[PDB]
Every structure is written in structure tokens, then in C-alpha cells.
């Protein structure tokens, strides 16, 4: 890792969570962590099935 540095490019201004926040199709709240883990297991099961 020290011998081969991979430097980050500066023009990457579009992050994923920031550009989805700008869309009307994503809303925001605060929930528990274990609640958000159980949703992502339920959602990710619903995706693959």
C-alpha cells in the first residue's frame, strides 16, 4: 500500500447519497441501527427473490 499510491481525483463531485438526496424520491429520517439492519435484510431479500 505504501509502494503503490492510488491518488483520488478531485473532479468526483457527484457522491451517491448526496445526489439521491436531491431527488424527490428519497426521504430522510433517523431510526435505530438494528431497525435499519432488519429493513435492509427484508429489502435485500425482496430484491433477490
Amino acid at each position: 500500500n505504501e509502494l503503490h499510491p492510488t491518488l483520488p481525483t478531485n473532479h468526483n463531485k457527484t457522491k451517491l447519497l448526496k445526489s439521491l438526496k436531491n431527488t424527490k424520491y428519497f426521504q430522510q429520517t433517523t431510526i435505530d441501527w438494528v431497525e435499519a439492519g432488519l429493513q435492509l435484510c427484508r429489502q435485500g431479500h425482496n430484491m433477490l427473490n
Binding site: 435505530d32 438494528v34 431497525e35 432488519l38 435484510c41 427484508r42 431479500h45
Partner: protein, 48 residues
Amino acid sequence: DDDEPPLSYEQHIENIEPLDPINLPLDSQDDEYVKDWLYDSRPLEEDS
């Protein structure tokens, strides 16, 4: 088990007292400057 679904947060998890976490007892005369805020979620978050 893989047959039972992931049980819902609200019917099962949210109603119960959690449990004690892993916390060292933090002797008061030797650790008095950190013992009030060491095991917070974000320590000293609202201290200006």
C-alpha cells in the same frame, strides 16, 4: 433458522429494555475527567 423470517423490530425488539454493554468501571479518583463522557455515542458532542 432460514425458514423463519426476520422478526419485526416493533413487535419484538423495541418494547424491551436492551442490556448492559461492555463498560470498564472507571475508578473515580484516577479517571474523573473522562468518566462522565467516555462511553457516549458521540463523546462531548454538545460540549461547545
